[PDB]
Design goal:
Layout lengths: L2 E2 L8 H17 L3 H4 L3 H12 L19 H4 L8 H13 L5 H15 L32 H9 L5 H8 L9 H4 L13 H8 L2 E5 L5 E5 L4 E2 L1 H8 L1 H11 L2 H17 L2 E2 L13 H4 L2
Parallel strand pairs: 1-5
Antiparallel strand pairs: 2-3, 3-4
The protein binds protoporphyrin IX containing FE (HEM) and 1-(1H-benzimidazol-1-yl)propan-2-one (2NZ) (2 copies).
One 1-(1H-benzimidazol-1-yl)propan-2-one binds next to helix 10 and strand 4.
PDB class: oxidoreductase
Keywords: Model system, flexibility, dynamic, side-chains, energy penalty, occupancy, Boltzmann weights, flexible docking, ligand binding, oxidoreductase
Assembly: monomeric
Amino acid sequence: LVHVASVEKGRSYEDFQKVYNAIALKLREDDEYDNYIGYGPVLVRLAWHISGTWDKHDNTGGSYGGTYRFKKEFNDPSNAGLQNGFKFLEPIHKEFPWISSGDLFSLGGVTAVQEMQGPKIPWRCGRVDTPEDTTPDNGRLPDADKDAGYVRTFFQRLNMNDREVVALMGAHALGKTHLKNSGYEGGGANNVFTNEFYLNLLNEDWKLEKNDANNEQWDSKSGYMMLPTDYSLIQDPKYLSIVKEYANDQDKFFKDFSKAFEKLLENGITFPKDAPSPFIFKTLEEQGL
Ligand code: HEM
Ligand SMILES: CC(=O)Cn1cnc2ccccc21
Ligand SMILES: CC(=O)Cn1cnc2ccccc21
């Protein structure tokens, strides 16, 4: 399958900056969500889940087709909770209905990361909505109850290497788990994008426990948690070295995350040679808004 980026007709950087700004302003406005975490983290998770269905072998899934809007994918057990992100984005789409669904979902994740003081994430437009029969089947997103070998193999399907995997996982600095969504008991949560996932992994005193949903997770006396797939990053010595690097270099983590997250959001898309260059959106704060 070939999916060629096609710019929404007549649109340019300023059109997309307006969408970014509407998302950003709504993020500031709807601050009470999920015990005052706000919607930033769920929007990052949504952008990842709409992209993480990709399969490099046949170019099925991926962000291009905007297929999360269809019930099969919307109702994926792996996507439980993301409906909150979809609902947040609904008025934005109503205000800017020219934007494609995949462009909106991916842009929501970019905006969330930046507005949460994360790195700039260059972003390209041109995803085109594809029909219902292009929706990938459920089961392509990763399990949390698994080990480092599973994580490494899993992410090969998304064409991600060890450093890309470890950098992407740093998004677990954000937000929390919810027992009703995923069967994992949430711990201390934040809504600022930092390298704190790596610091938390290395510095806390972790104990393996079984939660009320019968699932194992690692818990600290300080009140934090890690998934078994998170903790795998310090069990595997390849991943461990990279964890240590990002715990000790905030700029390097930012730079590597930005590249990996752009790549995740662009997997499966062919950009014509005369497509616009990636856009780097200004934050509300940079605009004085
Ligand atoms: C092995 C890979 C991964 C697994 C198994 C995994 C699993 C999970 C689980 C179980 C949750 C809790 C969902 C809920 O209960 O609401 C979660 C939340 C989250 N995940 Fe991941 N994840 C992985 C990779 C990623 C990546 C690559 C990103 C993005 C770059 C990401 C971003 C997030 C965010 C931001 C949240 C918090 C959402 C919220 O607070 O509502 N995750 N993840
Ligand atoms: C309001 C609307 O046009 C619905 N809609 C159509 N595509 C969308 C993508 C994200 C959120 C909502 C979306
Ligand atoms: C600060 C921290 O690492 C919190 N955390 C640790 N693992 C997580 C999984 C999903 C969401 C958040 C998670």
